Amino acid sequence: SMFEIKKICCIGAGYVGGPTCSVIAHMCPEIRVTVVDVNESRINAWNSPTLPIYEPGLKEVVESCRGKNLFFSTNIDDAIKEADLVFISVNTPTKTYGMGKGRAADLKYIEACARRIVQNSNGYKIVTEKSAVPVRAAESIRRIFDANTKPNLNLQVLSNPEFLAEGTAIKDLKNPDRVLIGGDETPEGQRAVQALCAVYEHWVPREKILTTNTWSSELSKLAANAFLAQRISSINSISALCEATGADVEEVATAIGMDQRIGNKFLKASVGFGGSCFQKDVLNLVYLCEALNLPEVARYWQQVIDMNDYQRRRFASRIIDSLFNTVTDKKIAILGFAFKKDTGDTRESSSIYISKYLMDEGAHLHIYDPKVPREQIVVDLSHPEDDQVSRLVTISKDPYEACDGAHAVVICTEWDMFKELDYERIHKKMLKPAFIFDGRRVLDGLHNELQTIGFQIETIGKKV
Amino acid sequence: SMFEIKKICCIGAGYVGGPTCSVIAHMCPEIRVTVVDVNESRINAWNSPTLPIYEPGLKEVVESCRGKNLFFSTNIDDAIKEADLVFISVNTPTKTYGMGKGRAADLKYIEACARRIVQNSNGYKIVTEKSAVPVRAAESIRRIFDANTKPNLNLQVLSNPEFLAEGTAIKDLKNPDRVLIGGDETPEGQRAVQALCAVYEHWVPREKILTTNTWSSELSKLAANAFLAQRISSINSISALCEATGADVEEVATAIGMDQRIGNKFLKASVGFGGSCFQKDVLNLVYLCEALNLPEVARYWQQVIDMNDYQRRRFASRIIDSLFNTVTDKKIAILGFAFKKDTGDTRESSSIYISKYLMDEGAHLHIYDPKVPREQIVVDLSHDDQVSRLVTISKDPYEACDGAHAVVICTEWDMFKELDYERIHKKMLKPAFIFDGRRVLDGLHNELQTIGFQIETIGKKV
């Protein structure tokens, strides 16, 4: 309102900072947006005709304003000096050792940015956390600024979390459900908050811009992903009950989802949710609870993970039991390795875990995924040159090789192609009894024809 | 359309059967709908100008078709003989003893109906469970029919659960989010399912009528109330974290609820959910899981109740710590006793539980609620000497607050934001606390701090 952002700097040219800043430039022609990164190779790519990130619509957005008001540079320090607003958009990996190993977020990159910003800054700037951060991250940035102050240096700290999913990043940026901005409840804080609102007001309606305090903002990002993951674990818990009673989890999911207060999204049973966001955010929320002496809340959210873990384990057990509790040297087809369809991302994929369970039985796994690189599958199934993987794991170039001589076909990722395969042919060449374990309900409605063909076909959330 | 339902009999003239059948008759002029009950007094009332159930819109519906195609009668046996479709719409109270005491559903009334139906039936009929039943209830009706069969007796069993809330029953029947009908995956089951679909098709669009197997149908009713309860416990869990960090739970709930995949309903933090459906249904789910050797699933759903109970307990503890952990002969005002605003219903009301905690500290409660009858409050807080010594029921809020150390809002009635707080302050003992258990005073905070209250609320840091 009073203050006007005219220059933005984004430290971090990854999957958050690049696209967000590209859309900001596209929508705000009068604002100069400079995306910076230490990685010279990456910056060069952003300035090339082959962008380092593939996202539908991104190329068009970047090419429409790069060189006009959108810039990519390795000159971090100059970008900061010039900036009115600086986004910090670096990753916060999970700690791999020490207090909170495996669960707590590691602020090392956030801290390095804060130190660098204060070292290169004079006068008034707004500094905004854009990466997924743990609650209190802004407190730390503020401590660093307060401890390294200079005359006439006035840095304001805001939180502005990202709500982007892979594959929908541009749509999500152009037409967001909401934009969330957190700042202090002081006149300074509210000045800063309003300045960044005005940026988003160039293309987002005021009623979709939610302003909060900084802790509410940070906590909403974590909490939102926990609520989404909870719906999957809840419908997965129902799937177990369906298998025991004769109910069908897709019928039940549809019935529950038609109540508009619950809604019909995120109610699809599966072998288990995956990706780099759901488990990580829930565990981060559980760690935070324990750290604040809220064990009841900690144990309440831990259930979302325990349930996902159980869902995977019981699926593996149905497989193994159906093979008479011996799978040593039995060939099994694993169709699908990505954590979900239409990606090559294997981070926390249920396919990894199902696979490790069968490896632990001596299975000879032939794994097919149309999009995941074969080197990645080998890494994911290896211990942190791995003999168990080279002894037990074959990566198949087509799905027929993977089923050929197999005892079971296990569908772990919901790629659409898997429902189109020649199952008559696959049946001829399998050992008998021939099983199909559908971990994604993707073969619904082929059931009768598959049983006619001769398969024992089994799925999640359906009684055998 | 092979088979056409032309006569419907509903056994049970209560809150479910009466209104549902009244709406069916209203919407299906060619169908004769006869609601029966053993309780002659109640039937008479359904035939009177003062219906035994108050529901907005119900009188108009009933008066528009009673005596034309809608009938209420104590002649249960004739209605069954005539009927093409018989609804069983009786209560299934929770067992009060024995295996599953306090959690399992008691099928005695459902069984009695089934046995009576088979005794009075010949030929083809469709029998449909309309009451909230445990999973496998239809199996039991089936077993009874199969065990007491007669030549040419062909009874088909369907599930058709109710999704009505008090106060919105007519709206919910005229314009339902969905109609759910479960039946066997056999030609005869599908024929039966289609006949009942056709009844609903007189006024509900086909895309809103969901057909399933019988177990899916029974399980969906229980699961829906459980998912809804989970949202409240989930946002309540966040409210604890807000109090510890400085986040505000209403800011967080808005942020979360604007994601269209989550939605913005049922995300209002409180001292705790209540009512006769949520805890009951979740507990029945937990019991069914244990029975079926699904302990992981059981413990997943118990968290919904354990969280609600913790929310109530930590709220009471805040109140108690604020008066130094000694409330004995302290006067405290409880404003609101209903489980939610705009009802007299106290079933599983968080006000009961808050109040019982303070009573266990020796607090003198003065309780006001604008619609709950006094005798209901006395019963709810009894096992009674602890009540008569410690509980006073006030005819107005100002009495209850007069000379109180604290004012505790437990039910979100709109009138509580309109009270003369300057007045209440003049007459309270100092420090004068208001504990808002419902976020109903949000936005009066600054001025209430100005007046001199130490105002505290759920999901906000002190």
Next chain:
Amino acid sequence: INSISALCEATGADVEEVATAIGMDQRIGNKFLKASVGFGGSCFQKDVLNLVYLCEALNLPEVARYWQQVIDMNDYQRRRFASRIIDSLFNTVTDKKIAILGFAFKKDTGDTRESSSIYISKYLMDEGAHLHIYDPKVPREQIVVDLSHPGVSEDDQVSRLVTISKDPYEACDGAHAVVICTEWDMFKELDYERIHKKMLKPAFIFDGRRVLDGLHNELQTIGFQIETIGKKV
């Protein structure tokens, strides 16, 4: 052998076939291998509990717990038998008439001490069952004592819920279930066709002693659901 009966019910093996096979090994012997709803009498539980207590007194918790299993198993065998009954009646037995045939701890005596009939009857009382109890030797006064809350000369629950029958046909007349808890030889000679006519349907016979073995097809033809210990349903 009771623990094996549970496994028989789960798999399709028959506990009497298994008992006979095990017992023909002369090192094991064929005595005391008869599956039941549970052992009773004034000796077994008391002596085993005494032994367990001695172990704990002597800091031998491993031996204590080894022997405690003989009791725990017996309690489980009782509880799961009652649960079969109750589950078969839809988990509600309030005001249902159920015949209890046999109250003595074993046949051919009036001794009821620690009889499994007392425990199965107490489980069905906790469901509100209306129990009609018949035994050819046990005095009626002793049954009333055995089911009463001790130190209560007139129990409200016993007089509301329990009827002592002077004949088995009275006990089964209008019953949902006939529960045989003691192995009296007379029970295999009963006129079951007659019993079936006047029972409510579905009509269950729960044989807690294997005393109706070989009658099963005949009882299924008459139209009973006949269930017993150590046979799959």
